[PDB]
Write a structure and sequence with these properties.
Strand content of chain A: 15-25%
CATH class of chain A: Mainly Beta
Number of strands of chain A: 13
Chains A, B, C, D: catalase
Bound molecules: protoporphyrin IX containing FE
Assembly: tetrameric
Oligomer: homotetramer
Keywords: functional class, oxidoreductase
CATH superfamily of chain A: Catalase core domain
PDB class: oxidoreductase
Entry title: Crystal Structure Analysis of Catalase from Exiguobacterium oxidotolerans
CATH architecture of chain A: Beta Barrel
Shape of chain A: globular
């Protein structure tokens, strides 16, 4: 195999620059060097705005139970159907090469290359979020991100944002358990967090939540375990998940679905479209869908794991987004950031390409590798053999329930009630882990009012938790 | 054929946005709409900084005569060998959709997809150039480019540069004949302008110049003729050349080489490596090489004619650049601008991709469509099966003739002598044309000193042309 | 002034590259050369996807009549207030350096640097548009743009689209008069085309349309006149408007507003919010607002006219978009394309920069010249003196009138009615010019049933015009 | 202070998206939301290809001793002259948010904002490099970078490359002492590694090396110490250096220079221009130049530390690059990558901007914030007030010493000899640490031939090291 330039010219000497004499300066005419150095200079692209640290693998999804009752999604009609998937697991706040032992939700992303298009599942392990409207997401992230001067994450900064956005209480309850540091990607669950809509063949729509349950079980690290691991291996989760697949101990998860009829949405003490809210298995049963097996590592990380883009509003027919106000901003954000991060034709890259043929009138854009060449780039047109709309594929109408449009916060926020229930649903071990992690984190806040507000927010959720935090801190909340 | 999103989801309704009601505001969840518009939003890329305006087509090069004597270049070894080519012809100064009736050199670019890699011929119709050092190219372009306030080309600006850089005189002789406006791309010659080095299997090197000769002959347009054409068709040359191919009237050119022994370089009243100097056919004979035939229009202009990059420094084994100081900056410039204009991985696109297989240790970069998957991305390595250098392909050594490096103008400039020779080689018809065009261009110069300088420069070249310019302008030339 | 590199190093020799000898190859260590070339290599950015060709100038808006009864827009409160403006005028379909003699609507864009933010008016001269839903815009553009193979605009393609999308009929009536070729940018009107919403201090909203009247009158070119101009000057309108300002003949326009109560939207034979429909002066009267004077040319085309971004959705308090399905896509499109075309931080460039101060929690992005330095990059936050929201500026609620969202075409299409009205409002001159231009255009269509359809669409609008086109073409229309 | 959009419009509600009803879907017309999310989507830019993990601060350089004897560099003429500096320290191989406890050279970069332009010092702590020609850098970096499939650094890969490129031996001797892991940025030295050239007022040139000596002393961490620190703090060095400055304990370094007359270069058992070679203090004395004090943290990491670009070939008059083949490729590469990573106009950003004024003929390029507005954008020109060249600043000619140019490896490679002396110059504790670290590293190599090669490479430098490695490994080297 001959070494070549990008021009296919064979290289004779890959060790020496062309110089003006044996010990003289380098020549501008060294095309081979400059081509090599110039490409090297251009290897890097922007990391993900969040969830930059991650691990991806290939596998298959296998449907066990037909879902035709709830959705007319092609792949979900018949038990036994298998769909290729690519998955990516990730942390959130810190960058590429950041340790995998930090406290963070863990991203859980699955691209399904379906016969009717790509569907992206893009969730986290943790079943709720800090906030309920996309308007706040840059703020939340900016608050959690390293301090913009010091480049170091500072709890004084994020506890500020969080205390003043008290809907974050419930998420705080989850993230400061030991479930805030999974032991690895293969030992964690997945959650859609948002409701979506599934519509069946007759146009009945239900609200659905999605649920991944690992065959290896949920396994977490305590703070001291995380520190121990960090010192030895800053790539532990990636390492462990890569080795398991390479050794043939294939990571597997089961997919379950929760179904809530639209006519029942007022029936709870919470808005079911609020992303700060969970649907307890107790109140809404999990129904088995199928199982994902990841059985093949990437061939190349950059081209596969780094270059994939997912979007929760990338859905197949039979699937629609919910009105969830946090989800609604995501629909835009993901693809929007990918046009910048990966490129305008990012959907043409092997890792992003659908299994279904792409036939449309879109054209051009930088690096047009899979340019459709028909000169007929407009629709409607006169030609019968060019791509046409298939009316049966139109997304059905959905209901509107208000007489006004504008900036209108939902009515039943219930910022503390469900958070309290989540606390009381925990075992003693979980409640003690939560207290020690919260205390350790609040000891790092440098503004008293923020600490007071944090303890107060927790107190409203559960009085005894708030009392314990008060004692450990030691800040008396009694006057308030 | 089903119409689809870039995700492979069949589109039901390609005519209506999803709105909050039949006469309501558009929804951010309209993924189909946003994908479509966002891609549309990104269709465009930067135009070529020069030669933006152009036309491309595919064809074949047939070598008629073996070049073994002069070069070891594989495709040139045997009579009858055929190489696929892609050619682009161009104006220079104005942008995309610029009239093709403007006075400019015309670009003549040919990519040869060779058994030993790509070779780009990148020349103009005209046999010489305005300057002799790349250092001056941005200045020269900026002077000819539309005034940066008015956005209209102004003779007052570029005559300023050209008079103050007297080496331009020779090019001014050519450019202001009627050969400044070719009738069509098919009715023009091609010139390498610079000499290059060819090296044979034995290791002898010769200076060479390359030459394209139109089967349809050289045909030009007077000013008034160009004005007539321009009013009815601003894409006239692209239109003619497109139609010619489609009608089966394939444009052909014969290629010729001029050969100069490096030992004979100081035997002239000019420096043969000076880009402002021609190699007259009567001094160095044209030797036939073969013939190019353009026999297929692009399937798609954007992915072919817009997205192609050429570099005079993209050479196959057997070829090397000369030390011509204008050429030497071009070796860098072209591939550098393509990395910007087209993208880091521009050599991966089909129009740029070699016929010879590419095998190397380069990786990543934006849109890594053709990523090499082997994890061995470093050389030297322990693996016999990975790409290896092939020493017999090592570019040969070349003489150094000085004991200092630095910023050092050539001795024999001869800024006016050959410019004179060229004029006295013209027919009386061409000399009248030169005068009419010169006068009509010099009439637009608002600084009398620039006008005087032009006149002196032409005078030093040929005293009769000088006095004629003076008489017509009318500024007598007895003082200075 | 000493000539310097971008590093601030004074340059000794700007004429010669650094070479390995007087006649030797160029050195890679020539930083000065490489910096200069590499920057030249990067001068170009993408041109606008539409309206690439254009001219900009600075000026002033003077408000003459208070608009307080209709809007609480600060700058519109007091008769006498001046706002600085930047305006850009353009053709539509072809690229940079394309003739300004071509048949095209003309862009009319004005940035108002107001005390309460930038307001961008982004209209055309013609008062209607070809289509009424943004979903169709890429298709409409693609059909009108050069054929993706020949690189020449083809009536056979765009008629194909326009006939198949018969809502276009009204716009064809307009664009095929002589008004399709304005004599220049100063000699044309401007239209909002869409209605917008103005909201007052008491919270009443009205539908509004905006209207620019030239002090110079509306002046147009016939096909033959445009053809004669084109031969001589392809920059004719830019040239005219530039010179006019230097000469002190300041291009001026009066601004007029047409008002409509949301209560009266059903009292017409058309949907007021349909972009294919005009609001006739004699049905909704023009009310005078103020005058714009353009009194200063750009210092630099690139940094001003090239680099400016407008968006019709960039509105000041007191203004809101209507539900016009074409407008609603524009809200997204413009800013979207600018982030790609100009850059993520395009709003930080002087030409785009507001007069009002920018204070928020956004950060970073490529080329962050005006980066906000405060480490408090999140809101809410504990700091009294960091930026805070001002609730009285909250865009107020707007009625919703449907109980479903979805892909739902409007009721009163009236694709031909008002198109006929328009034709019958024309003088005999205009009707003659329309006939000539249409026939000349329809003679270039190569497909029978497209021509037939065009004549039928025009016939449905007006029987006599239908007959005359039928007569001239010449197909009898007795059957169908 | 009012919260505003990038348009300067006051925001009233920064908490709620505009939605089609209180519990309905989000509106495309929420300009405020989309501007916000869309800028957030674009915050990230590519990290540095190498040395992505870093820390920057401002300060001052004070010249203690005139250097006029050796250079005519303006800032170095007079004792007591003070120049502003920005410094950045960094690791090498891993990405942003990588631990600072990893084994790697440590980058030491200093930008001097001089009265005659910017000078960049761009060195490492360690005084030699792994390779001696730029041709090999991508390969070396690829071998050291995470395996492109596992995303984990693998000694089996980098030992492959290193053993097969035995010139690396000397650097291995350095990097595998505990100096492979400095305790922080303020407790490490700096080295130019390369010689450069200094030219005085008379045109005499000497070769110089540059040396930074920390007031705080050189302090390192053993492997176990590094492990302990890593578990607790992955930002330790950034943390420590930022706190020192913030507490008023300013990091200081003394700058020293070593001088070698060009007439003495043949006098050593090594080529003094080989970047794998050190110039021992006892062979060429260090001469005090001045001191750097870092006294001011950044206001903003992104705009300062992230967006700064340095290039060792960015030199002031009085300074020139040496013909060092490693240094030669760096002259091109730094500015090349920055054009991509930061932007074509990267030199216009506050952190990169010279102290000295920038006056030249370059124009345009993306985000032209500091566009020079003069319409005279070409040189030579007629105007005496426009930027002119200053011939006294012309870079002096330098010697050439060969009669050929081509790919020509230096003759006295001495790959093992100096490496031997470096080992023999070590203390016994340094020698034990070296052995422990090498053994720990070579136990992770999985190919016997590479371990044997490594051991043989060390043996050739020093027999007792070769034996100690052989015994500890346990690999028999006797048969060879
Ligand atoms: C009544 C309908 C329309 C009018 C009057 C109009 C007018 C204009 C004008 C005047 C410009 C040039 C602005 C400038 O000088 O910078 C422009 C550019 C543009 N238009 Fe529109 N247009 C219309 C419809 C649309 C639609 C439906 C879309 C797609 C949703 C669209 C997308 C664009 C884009 C992407 C640009 C490029 C802007 C830039 O690069 O900054 N236009 N249009
Ligand atoms: C002994 C030789 C070398 C030393 C001492 C060295 C040191 C450094 C340092 C300290 C930085 C970080 C600058 C900063 O803080 O921004 C850096 C970055 C970099 N280096 Fe070198 N390096 C060496 C060799 C090379 C070579 C041979 C090349 C290839 C031609 C190279 C290419 C690069 C590139 C492309 C960057 C990224 C710069 C940017 O994005 O701004 N280095 N190096």
């Amino acid at each position: 195999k001959k070494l070549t330039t990008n021009q296919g010219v064979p290289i004779g000497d890959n060790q020496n620059s062309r110089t003006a004499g044996r010990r003289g300066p380098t020549l501008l005419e060294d095309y081979q060097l400059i081509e090599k150095i110039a490409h090297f200079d251009r290897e890097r692209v922007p990391e993900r705005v969040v969830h930059a640290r991650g691990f991806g693998a290939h596998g298959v999804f296998k449907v066990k139970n037909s879902m035709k009752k709830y959705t007319k999604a092609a792949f979900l009609q018949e038990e036994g159907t298998e769909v290729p998937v690519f998955a990516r697991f990730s942390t959130v706040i810190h960058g590429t090469h950041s340790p995998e032992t930090l406290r963070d939700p863990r991203g859980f992303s699955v691209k399904f290359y379906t016969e009717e298009g790509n569907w992206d599942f893009v969730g986290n392990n943790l079943p709720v979020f800090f906030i309920r409207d996309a308007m706040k997401f840059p703020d939340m992230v900016h608050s959690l991100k390293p301090d913009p001067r010091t480049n170091i994450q500072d709890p004084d900064r994020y506890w500020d944002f969080m205390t003043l956005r008290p809907e974050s209480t419930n998420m705080l309850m989850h993230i400061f358990t030991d479930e805030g540091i999974p032991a690895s990607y293969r030992k964690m669950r997945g959650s859609s967090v948002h409701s979506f809509k599934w519509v069946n063949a007759h146009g009945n729509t239900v609200y659905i939540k999605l649920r991944w349950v690992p065959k290896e079980g949920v396994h977490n690290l305590s703070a001291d375990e995380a520190t121990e691991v960090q010192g030895k291996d800053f790539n532990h989760a990636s390492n462990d998940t890569f080795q398991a697949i390479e050794n043939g101990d294939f990571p597997e998860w089961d997919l379950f679905v929760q179904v809530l009829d639209p006519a029942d949405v007022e029936n709870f003490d919470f808005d079911p479209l609020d992303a700060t809210k969970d649907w307890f298995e107790d109140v809404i049963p999990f129904q088995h869908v199928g199982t994902m097996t990841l059985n093949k590592n990437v061939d190349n990380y950059f081209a596969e794991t780094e270059s994939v883009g997912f979007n929760p509003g990338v859905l197949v027919p039979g699937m629609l987004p919910s009105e969830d106000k946090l989800l609604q901003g995501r629909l835009f954000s993901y693809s929007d950031t990918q046009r910048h991060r990966i490129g305008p034709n990012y959907q043409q890259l092997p890792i992003n390409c659908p299994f279904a043929q792409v036939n449309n009138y879109q054209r051009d854009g930088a690096m047009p590798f899979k340019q459709q060449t028909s000169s007929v780039n407009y629709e409607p047109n006169r030609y019968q053999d060019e791509p046409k709309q298939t009316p049966e594929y139109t997304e059905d109408t959905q209901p509107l329930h208000d007489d006004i449009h504008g900036r209108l916060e939902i009515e039943k926020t219930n910022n503390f009630g469900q958070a309290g229930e989540v606390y009381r649903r925990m075992t003693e071990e979980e409640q003690m882990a939560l207290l020690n992690n919260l205390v350790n984190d609040l000891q790092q806040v440098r503004h008293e009012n923020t600490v007071l507000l944090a303890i107060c927010n927790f107190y409203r959720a559960d009085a005894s938790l708030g009392e314990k935090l008060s004692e450990a801190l030691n800040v008396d909340i009694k006057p308030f």
